[PDB]
């Protein structure tokens, strides 16, 4: 028998509208690093100035990175007091953990305070917390730590996403979607907070993929408030989450691997990451657009007629996706702007881009929060090789 | 505040409650008798000179409520790794080498059993939730499990790392929203825990680390969760109706865990059984109001629901029983798993769920929950976090 007790009404009432972004806040550590002269600083502080050839290669990596500056919790004083972090391969995890278990929820709190202020509702209305970081682990997690720092209700429903990597900006959108939609009244605080203190290390002539990481990764935290059924005249919608998908791309074993070791977090590239992403992105998107839009003539937007939020893992990914899909160069502009101003902040990146997109749209008096377009994409890429796809709708603006 | 015109939900949602459709479990092959574990433990850590500490540990084991545990570790592995037999040696790297391979492996064993019971093609799994407190890696154990099972590369994964002992409740809360908000979703949930990250030699000045050595065992459990079971094809066992999370008052620092170069370290700083047992009544009173209302004759007593309680240790079960005035039968299923397996962290509560339905079938009871319609699943861990889940059984 597949017998069951008599049905009862859904005991936890669900919402009816789509999960909606209601506020966005961001924060970065206070130490600014100009990319043009980062090689000078980096080879000085790692006591590596005798590696003249390797410094030239690193100057090339920095010059070609698409990054103008980065923010970091680390500075010269902290690094000098921790020589094991300045070496390429010395036991360090303990001091790295000591830093990030405190500083990632601290930075997350700064971003969350800004999101909550914009939202304009009292903190006690937050029912769910999603915390995402690739920088350290602890028990209780950063989610608990953030709850304490902000003074949220002790009954918030928390989800702690540790050690996930660069695609997880897409993942948290996918997680928040179901939380918000399946729970009437739920208001989800999503915080992504990333610090390079776990990955910073000195240079090695035989590990150029680890060196690329030293040129690309920067610090940042972003926070959003997600809910369904926004309260009219009280809350303000900015983006709607309509579709989510995840894909391990074909032939991509080992493309991006990271290991938490006694020497800290190591970062490995072993496949042509921009090549794998660009080779497969068309089928990923074609499937997503079919699910969202169907396929009747004149009903499916062209890729040039949606807004783009693409994780800028490096400039080559954006370049090769733009080439493969024949995007006009303005499509990737917002994603490139955040790469320029902040570098690769791992999971936090895509929310910085989302914030930049709406703020530029308002300033330039465009017809929507997504550059004048109704529909858009948010894409995360990372270990797997995992591609996270999110189809969004903007909101109309007065032009 | 304007929006575009509303449209129908683009990913259709389900209508019924999230339902447990299958359960499978698995344990490493090395069995450890709890009565003689102090002999084994003090020998393999070369600590036989700590005569008074061993007496203390024999007492802890005698009173643990545990008869046996399963572990990936054994004498051979431990002799090859003296840095794990010391109290405080750099070891993380070898611990990680073990658990990044072995926790998805053990999870795959439990998952294959769940999937076989479920009876549906594995390509029908749409989501994976992987939960562990044993190691971290990128890609994570969710990706590894997906590869080992041959699941569809488009499965939507949720990787829950470094969670701790409450997370068996957390994954029920996560699976609920995944299943209910997505028509057709079938969620593979796996909890897999290995003591290789926490095992270490004894210290006469850190008795709380000695607690973990007496209580923690290894295991993995897997469930298939979905809403709207396919008629005459899938078989419901339990329904998820209500979930809540609470950080209990005055519990700051009661249970901390840190991942260090010496592995995962375990710290107890307040009266954990006391904090849980003194605050659980308020938590459950709230959940029962939300689920059943406040009307005379409408709300079941705690004695008239089935219990699935994370057996962090015997004192938690004993004090919850006393503070809530439970008859002794209520904690029996939870105590049975503690006896047969020890504290398997997040995986425990799903072992208890499996035992409960299996004992119900073999004893020809009226429901999959010991004959009771409504039940509770509780997880407890760092925070101090209490995860509460109200379940419904099915008639038998």
Residue numbers in the entry:
A (entry chain C): 5 to 403
B (entry chain A): 6 to 401
What did the paper state?
Chalcone synthase, a well-studied ubiquitous plant-specific type III polyketide synthases (PKSs), is the first key enzyme in the flavonoid biosynthetic pathway. The biosynthesis of flavonoids starts with the condensation of one molecule of p-coumaryl CoA with three molecules of malonyl-CoA through the catalysis of chalcone synthase (CHS) to generate naringenin chalcone. Functional characterization of two chalcone synthases (CpCHS1 and CpCHS2) indicated that CpCHS1 can catalyze the formation of pinocembrin, naringenin, and eriodictyol, respectively; however, CpCHS2 was inactive. The crystallization investigation of CpCHS1 indicated that it has a highly similar conformation and shares a similar general catalytic mechanism to other plants CHSs.
The crystal structure of CpCHS1 was elucidated in the apo and presence of its final product naringenin, and detailed structural comparisons of CpCHS1 with EaCHS from Equisetum arvense and PpCHS from Physcomitrella patens revealed common differences between CHSs in the local conformation around the active site pocket. And by site-directed mutagenesis, we found seven residues, especially Leu199 and Thr203 that are critical to the catalytic activity for CpCHS1.
